[PDB]
């Protein structure tokens, strides 16, 4: 995900530049070129943490007819009515003494603790009490569900559930009536490229490529996710990951600003400082080098690197574009000078190699 190094797989011609035309690279937007207008906005997200089974409780309303004639009781069944059932429910809940009860009487019994599990994708409800274990949901046309007895209905004791969201603040990235993505509250850029429309707990939103769900008004037409699609929880570990990445990118951006400013005030363009101008994220950027005291740039598209051996296969080889890149004197772009013995030296790789130290050929061998 987060590379150990970035080398350009595409590179243009070296043009001589003046130091005033140097700039520290943008490491925020990831491969959504042209989308650079940032507008601070708000967006919805899944609440942070684990989301247990969303329970909503209801009540089963069954209808009987009791005939008493001169201590003999006949008992018949009939299918009830929603509003009457809820009136009986208010009776039994508020403690109204009017619910306890050749004369016949119609009674409506209401067994209260009938819990159901609510699907967040579609607001369907799940309990063994429905036909097939599932009801379509409680819309406003259908204020009740059916049971397998088909003479007893189920109604919710509706008062909060689907309280699985939060309102976060971020930055919308665009370039004119097209939003490519957004910086989220953690500070990491997420791309809308390839997302699909997902309606979660009745809230219209989008599922990104990485499986995260957000809710934002997109000025574009996107197709719906298939009925099979799922979204990822907003677990604390995802926030940890984003915090680590953003921490690093901020740190290295400040270090690059200190380097660029230390170049302006001195006009001393070394190779150590030039490495701080490298683009740390896959995408289009710039590459720099120094030929015969002259300071030049080139357009480039940086590709994420996974291992150090990928770009150094042999003695003085810097694999760029499939073949080893040429060196003038002993330097390449972004300060990858050839080493003391014509090997390739990358500043980041040297730092990486050092922290692995203590490991090989302790060589505390002693003479005779």
């Amino acid at each position: 995900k987060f590379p150990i190094y970035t080398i350009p797989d595409e590179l243009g011609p070296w043009s001589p530049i003046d130091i005033h035309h140097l700039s520290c690279p943008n490491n925020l937007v990831v491969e959504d070129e042209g989308c650079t207008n940032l507008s601070e906005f708000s967006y919805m997200e899944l609440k942070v943490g684990y989301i247990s089974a969303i329970k909503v409780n209801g009540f089963t309303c069954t209808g009987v007819v009791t005939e008493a004639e001169t201590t003999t009781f006949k008992r018949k069944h009939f299918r009830p009515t929603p509003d009457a059932c809820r009136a009986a429910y208010n009776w039994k809940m508020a403690g109204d003494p009017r619910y306890e009860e050749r004369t016949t009487k119609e009674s409506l019994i209401i067994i209260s603790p009938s819990v159901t599990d609510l699907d967040p994708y579609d607001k369907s409800l799940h309990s063994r009490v429905f036909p097939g274990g599932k009801c379509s949901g409680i819309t406003v046309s259908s204020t009740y569900c059916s049971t397998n007895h088909d003479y007893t209905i189920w109604m919710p004791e509706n008062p909060t559930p689907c309280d699985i969201f939060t309102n976060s603040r971020g930055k919308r990235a665009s370039n004119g009536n097209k939003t490519c993505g957004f910086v989220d509250e953690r500070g990491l850029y997420k791309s809308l490229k390839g997302a699909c429309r997902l309606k979660l707990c009745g809230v219209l939103g989008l599922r990104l490529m990485d499986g995260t769900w957000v809710a934002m008004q997109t000025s574009d037409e996107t197709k719906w996710c298939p009925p099979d699609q799922l979204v990822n929880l907003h677990d604390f570990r995802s926030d940890e990951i984003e915090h680590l990445v953003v921490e690093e990118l901020v740190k290295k951006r400040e270090e690059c600003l200190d380097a660029l400013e230390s170049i302006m005030t001195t006009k001393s363009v070394s190779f150590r400082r030039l490495s701080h101008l490298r683009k740390l994220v896959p995408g289009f950027g710039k590459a720099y080098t120094i030929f015969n005291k002259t300071l030049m740039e080139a357009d480039a598209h940086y590709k994420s690197v996974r291992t150090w051996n990928e770009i150094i296969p042999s003695k003085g080889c810097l694999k760029v574009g499939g073949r080893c890149h040429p060196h003038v004197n002993g330097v390449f772009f972004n300060g990858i000078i050839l080493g003391p013995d014509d090997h390739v030296l990358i500043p980041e790789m040297q730092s990486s190699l050092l922290q692995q130290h203590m490991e090989l050929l302790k060589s505390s061998v002693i003479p005779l």
Partner: single-chain antibody
Amino acid sequence: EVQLQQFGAELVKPGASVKISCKASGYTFTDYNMDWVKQSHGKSLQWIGDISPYYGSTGYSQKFKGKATLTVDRSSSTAYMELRSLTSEDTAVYYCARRNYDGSWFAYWGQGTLVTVSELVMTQSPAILSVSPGERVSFSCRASQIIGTSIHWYQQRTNGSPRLLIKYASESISGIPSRFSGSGSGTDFTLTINSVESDDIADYYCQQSNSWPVTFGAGTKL
């Protein structure tokens, strides 16, 4: 020249380890990286990882992280790989390989060590080929995405090391007969051999070098 000496075989026990050796000579041991590949009985070649004898940097495919460990000894010019917690699924032939000067295609292979225990996918078509000698034949290798012309064709006779026949889908190799040729454009590559002969019945693998990690085709048998 150049030789990559390997030892014959090791018979190991489930759950134990073994350390395979690869002594390189003919070139400077530190001037090139060292790769390692696994080949099960009647299977294709699978890249395990590589090591730089100078820096000591290692690269591993996710399948072998924790299973294989790469080391070197620069005084003796010998690379070692250790396999611990062996299961029956680890019984295979383990080759050590040496790539080109730009690390695109495999230049040299070792004898191989059969250890006995008791990404871009390359869709290679067909698995088996049954035709008579003297005919002209051509099999296909198709990549999961665009790879330009970054693919190489290897021939492997029985109990032998793979031998590179074509580099970059069309370029010939000096010392190898003129019967082999390729046609590469985009995703679909075809290796054609005219005038099939007796020593040309073997397994043929295609290998891409466009993206990391390195992957091979399933293989085509004659």
